[PDB]
Design a protein around this ligand. Structure first.
Ligand SMILES: Cc1cn([C@H]2C[C@H](O)[C@@H](CO)O2)c(=O)[nH]c1=O
Ligand SMILES: Cc1cn([C@H]2C[C@H](O)[C@@H](CO)O2)c(=O)[nH]c1=O
Ligand SMILES: Cc1cn([C@H]2C[C@H](O)[C@@H](CO)O2)c(=O)[nH]c1=O
Ligand SMILES: Cc1cn([C@H]2C[C@H](O)[C@@H](CO)O2)c(=O)[nH]c1=O
Ligand SMILES: Cc1cn([C@H]2C[C@H](O)[C@@H](CO)O2)c(=O)[nH]c1=O
Ligand SMILES: Cc1cn([C@H]2C[C@H](O)[C@@H](CO)O2)c(=O)[nH]c1=O
Ligand SMILES: [Cl-]
Ligand SMILES: [Cl-]
Ligand SMILES: [Cl-]
Ligand SMILES: [Cl-]
Ligand SMILES: [Cl-]
Ligand SMILES: [Cl-]
Ligand SMILES: [Cl-]
Ligand SMILES: [Cl-]
Ligand SMILES: [Cl-]
Ligand SMILES: [Mg+2]
Ligand SMILES: [Mg+2]
Ligand code: NA
Ligand code: NA
Ligand code: NA
Lengths: 245, 246, 251, 251, 251, 252
């Protein structure tokens, strides 16, 4: 059995039904090495795939690249190969002043500012994580000693206008996203990232278990553009450990 | 002091920051009596308000009536009077064949088939419960010996076409909702009700903590038209409230 | 035989094909007693059901509760039991300075700021009353001697942000409804209520005859506070009108 | 003062506050001559404008052309020149089997299957006629001896796919409109035309009185090719009705 | 054999597979006379139809009237009569300060501020001209010595609020279009007209080749009242360009 | 002076380049760069591999976009901040018209916006349209390579599977919106599916940037035959040859 993009087979996964899915291909090996016997499987495009053992159980680590589209491909093809549980880890920008750099966020629900989520469920469907994964992620994050926030994540198909950044080439933002950061802020939204809406909606509507944990590397009340990453991947691995049956 | 609809003042609530919000006004006293010193506060329209004490702390029980609109009023006016945590309990129709009558469902997210939620946040915003409330509801429901399901709830502004019932006056359902139950079913949606989308969206976007627990009284794979489930449901929401009390 | 929510049967209605549908269950008896032989049928949730006779014909009075969702249930279940005509009565807040407290509004069309209407017809479908019912309601309202306004009603799924109220817990109104009050006022919208859009859309698309008449009890463009005698009279006149409107609808 | 398209001035209208607005420029003179002292004012593009007198009061007749866009231009520019009341008359195709060819329809609300209405009010706003105009049209229609239907009109930006016609170049209808006629039929929609949604929405949200009356030229459940003598009689009656409706509005 | 509105037959067209479609009925003759053996075919409503010969090949010239609805009818019925290629020429108002009065615009894509386009394809579908037609139009326009702009055209279902004109009867513009002018300007949109969105979307989704070329009559950042000689020269240049564009499209 | 956050390059790194060639695959970046003079690796972060090269004495950037509008929008934006004004998109595609063969080339004249990122630059009404000069240069270059070239509409999806109505998936389910969508696009004359054009074109057309998309057809959803290996390899090489030629035409 083969897949179009990931360059791996079901056999390469060694019966793994859980995958950790960072965005950056270069973080895949780093995640894999936190577990036992990390093995490089394949590397094509933004998709770097590693396999490792966690408490004697096979775990896949597969980068998604940036954004819902490349993420949806990874999730689908991993699903075709037996993966049922997806643990998202990444960096994020906080929009609440009380959420500090270094804090960890576990997404209880995503504002669907993406297009890919709509390819699995209409907008009315909630971009919500599997409750067990969100629970495992909260537990792993809190046990690590990190400061953890459970709440809503604004998930944008763009890094710049969709997160209302103005230090850009045009220096402007389409009507929809003008004043949007303050809007999300007033609505209690914790942070911005770019994959959770797609991942959560796709999985919640496909019989797949998913959750998102993110390390805050910037607070948007302070500035627009930028370890926390190291602690984040330790957390997602322990979250994976908690998810293992 | 005094809110437009609920007919109660902040002083009436005795410092209560948590509310249990059933739909049926007749359920209010039944919930209240499970706690200490229940007292009738006011009854206006579909809004019946009791105050009670749970482990020393004041707790409000307030009916919402059916639907997001009447619910949004209760939640807002209770919020004006200092309530920050809202525990929804009610009945629901399951759409998954493995979810049985008597089971309980704690909503982890609502399909927003309502209009009121849009008055607090755009459709992209997730109709999501507070995690502590959802966690407390699961624990409470499990401890009661009930079979508990965590998952997505379809929350409809109508009981009939929005939940794709056909045994109706017209026997007709608008295009949007034709085949919708099968669609939600394939998407793993657990059940139908009418208040969660509004409640969850409103609270999640207003700095209020909310969650929903529901006793399944009908499985929609079996039929369209629906008491031990009733009694167990309110005991759970009270225990969930106890877990939430700080 | 017995509808799930209203807890009544077709026999309970005594052949009634017309329902008067106030929002407040406590108003149901008051309306019923304006007619002959008022009889309490059932009371469940926000649904209080009476039956009465008007010119020898059975009329149902059934409360809807607040909002389109609970309203849609009452209308549907009454329709299952043979009711074909629905007369909405209540009180409302005017948003036009020329519309005074005590005046009455007959809705010719509703701004669909609700969600339940979408469960019967897509947004492009007009939330309009049956022409005969609107005609009857206008006639009854004018014959009562009150000043009557025929126009568009903003029908909101919320009492607060959807009607751009800022005196709230958050004090915040979502982008969609920011400045919406001014917008509706400029478009000539007469008033805000919370059931008409659902009711009118549901009925106009389901072969049911419906209309809405309301007594103006407050005006948000006027800082003046109406006296208790005016509010009481308005409340009484509104239900007097809807019963006379029913009388005109009877065949 | 001058306008951009109609080529008429306020002085040309001689104080007219009411306009009868047919779709076909050829129909303008036919309407005008039913009144006193018809005078050709201008003819630019689809806009043929006549002035006439009805019971001593100036009345403007102005064609709209086909569709909301050209209609919205006419209504706006007439409004700039002092016109406050607009009486739409036009041909239509019925979609209900109980509505016969030769019957008349007065629109109580329009299904907004257009785009121009959205330029005046969001979709939730009802495409509703002024109640006096609808009432005047119903009376004038009934008094002409015609069988009159009050109800919802589906108002489409296209003649073909938006009215679900398949006998076309591509024979294709976009997903949105596939099975739409059946849907409108089930929702009790009476007929198709192409201007009412824009007209009613624009006017209802701009402080203008508007209404639509139409002669049924074809029934979509029957045949597309109308019989000549029947068509002629219907069209003659429709313009007589709208003039009488204008008379009722001016009184 | 017979079309519903145009009043012409396939035989009338003499094997013409290309149509030049101006908006103004009066422009049809002007365009036809730029070609050989111009022949008046029919004139009904907005639809003035002429036939002519360009390099020995039949070309039909047909007015569309204002707006997508009347345009969609013309295109469809011409298509039924064998037309496969549609060349749009029309007047436009530019919104970019660098686009001068008298310049020419060839639409590379249209902002779909209309409703009729939605009757052929969902909003996500690009309102895009056929590449050959756009190429031919650009070449014709540039060869004429005109200053030519390739870019996006905002295509509105209204002349007034949809193009954010405030000098109107109400002086009001619905929320959607408030500040929309500035928005389109910042997005590099070149001009406003009222037919391209419908035309381009309809044709690109129906196997029909279409394109739009327009003479800039006014600039919205300047004045609304065009100078007569400048306008005349621009309009004359535009029709010469579209005919030469038609010549390039001839196979 | 600044180094853009994702691409990890500076304005000085680009050597005055105002045109960028933007493939999807990072591995293809060097392959494109070496078709020009003095290719130099600039940076590789995430799915973004950036090379600089020279075409007729003028600096040109080659930068991968990764898969999808979101990652593409980042690349385009940050290159734009560093002075890039013209973006030439090249990539593989799946044709959905029986008259389009594997090995043929498609130049997008407009994109069906089945994405989300495009909405972050312009409302849905706005056309996902290429710059006319870029589309013209791409057509000419494609023709000059001897390829069969198709000018037309491209469906640009945020997903490879349900948004392109693939049913051979984990769920085998396709959401209501996209059920029967393939046939709909086909009947509407849509030529192919890819996953970046709507975002790219909408973003650039509304931001004063020039952009165009050219694509090598590597598969046809209507043809049951398996694409020949030799044709596929030729198509890969031809597509990047064409885009460099298109760049040359755009430069001068
Ligand atoms: C810091 C930061 C990261 N991200 C996410 C998106 C990408 O997947 C990743 C790298 O930018 O981090 C944001 O969306 N917004 C931010 O402010
Ligand atoms: C049994 C059942 C209850 N409900 C909810 C709606 C009301 O709030 C309440 C009473 O009907 O229960 C549904 O929405 N669907 C159902 O099938
Ligand atoms: C005064 C007032 C009443 N109402 C309606 C809503 C309720 O159904 C009813 C009681 O508040 O009156 C409004 O919607 N807006 C108003 O301003
Ligand atoms: C007969 C008929 C007429 N019309 C309208 C549209 C035109 O404005 C006018 C002439 O066709 O009549 C329809 O829209 N649908 C129909 O079926
Ligand atoms: C001058 C001008 C013309 N037009 C078009 C619309 C009509 O089709 C035609 C005549 O006004 O020109 C606009 O849409 N906007 C403008 O500013
Ligand atoms: C063959 C094919 C490729 N693609 C694009 C998406 C990816 O960016 C790239 C590699 O799969 O090609 C499609 O979108 N659909 C298709 O059918
Ligand atoms: Cl990452
Ligand atoms: Cl920071
Ligand atoms: Cl309850
Ligand atoms: Cl049905
Ligand atoms: Cl059951
Ligand atoms: Cl009431
Ligand atoms: Cl007419
Ligand atoms: Cl013209
Ligand atoms: Cl590529
Ligand atoms: Mg700048
Ligand atoms: Mg029946
Ligand atoms: Na209610
Ligand atoms: Na027209
Ligand atoms: Na990517």
């Amino acid at each position: 059995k083969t897949v179009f993009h990931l360059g791996v087979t079901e056999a390469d996964l060694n019966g793994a039904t859980l995958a950790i899915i960072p965005g950056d291909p270069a973080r895949v090996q780093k995640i894999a090495e936190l577990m036992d016997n990390p093995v490089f499987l394949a590397s094509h495009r933004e998709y770097t795939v590693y396999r490792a053992e966690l408490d004697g159980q096979s775990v896949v680590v597969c980068s998604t690249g940036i954004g819902g589209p490349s993420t949806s491909i990874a999730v689908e093809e991993l699903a075709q190969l037996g993966v049922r549980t997806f643990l998202r880890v990444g960096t994020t920008g906080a929009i609440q002043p009380h959420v500090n750099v270094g804090d960890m966020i576990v997404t209880t629900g995503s504002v669907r500012l993406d297009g890919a989520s709509l390819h699995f469920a209409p907008m009315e469907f909630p971009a919500v994580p599997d409750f067990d994964v969100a629970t495992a992620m909260k537990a792993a994050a809190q046990e690590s000693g990190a400061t953890v926030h459970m709440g809503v994540t604004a998930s944008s198909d763009t890094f710049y206008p969709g997160q209302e950044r103005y230090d850009t080439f045009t220096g402007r933002v389409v009507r929809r996203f003008q004043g949007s950061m303050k809007e999300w802020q007033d609505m209690g939204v914790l942070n911005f990232e770019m994959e959770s809406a797609t991942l959560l909606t796709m999985c919640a509507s496909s019989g797949l278990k998913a959750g998102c944990v993110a390390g805050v590397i910037i607070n948007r009340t302070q500035k627009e553009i930028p370890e926390t990453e190291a602690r984040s991947i330790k957390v997602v691995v322990e979250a994976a450990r908690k998810m293992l049956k």
